[PDB]
Ligand binder design. Structure first.
Ligand SMILES: CN(C)c1ncnc2nc[nH]c12
Length: 217
């Protein structure tokens, strides 16, 4: 159940952290960017599979804050990940760079748009999270759970059964010095800055006292 990151992924994580060390808020931009790519992925698949959305009819990205439990949730109803995809897509490299990141970093150029361009921004979550939990269900597999603290990662079958229907949930156990992102006004502002150009609706579980979703894009 326990795996070690591929060495190249260990290096990529450090390069992404050092590049976005001064602008940690970018992690939420990438999580949104990733959630869109997953939704964009299942929508293309729906053009060829009439039952690709049977597990879940909505195509949304929903965000929840839990100040009491110190958690931040980013859920998308996209294509999702199988057990094998949780291990390979997150633990190794398998798409399409390291010299370019080093060259831009060594020659002192900016790389924020470079990480979001290749879609490796998932690891920027470790800028604000002590642990990253990924719950995902793919139409061709059962719902699994992926956990990591940047030192290793594990995958287990979700004992709660099929809860998501289809999609992924990125759960971040925010650090002690990242509780600023537990407040609502800061999250809603950050979400709106990065979710305008996403072709899918973005909801945030806010309060007013009753609670409900709030559209941001
Ligand atoms: C992390 N990664 C590459 C992902 N793969 C598939 N669906 C996702 N939804 C959010 N991130 C996702």
């Amino acid at each position: 159940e326990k795996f070690a990151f591929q060495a190249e992924v260990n290096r990529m994580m450090k390069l992404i952290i050092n590049s976005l060390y001064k602008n940690k808020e970018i992690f939420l931009r990438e999580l949104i960017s990733n959630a869109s790519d997953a939704l964009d992925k299942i929508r293309l698949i729906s053009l060829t599979d009439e039952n690709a959305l049977s597990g879940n009819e909505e195509l949304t990205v929903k965000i929840k804050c839990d100040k009491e439990k110190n958690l931040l949730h980013v859920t998308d109803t996209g294509v999702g990940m199988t057990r094998e995809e949780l291990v390979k897509n997150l633990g190794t490299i398998a798409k399409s760079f390291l010299n370019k990141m080093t060259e831009a970093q060594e020659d002192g150029q900016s790389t924020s748009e470079l990480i979001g361009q290749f879609g490796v921004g998932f690891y920027s979550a470790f800028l604000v999270a002590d642990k990253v939990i990924v719950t995902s269900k793919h139409n061709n597999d059962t719902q699994h759970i992926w956990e990591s603290d940047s030192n290793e990662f594990s995958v287990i079958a979700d004992p709660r059964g099929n809860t998501l229907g289809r999609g992924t949930t990125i759960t971040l156990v925010l650090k002690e010095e990242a509780s600023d992102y537990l407040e609502l006004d800061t999250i809603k502002n950050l979400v709106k800055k990065y979710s305008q150009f996403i072709n899918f609706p973005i909801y945030v579980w806010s309060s007013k006292t009753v609670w409900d979703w709030e559209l941001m894009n």
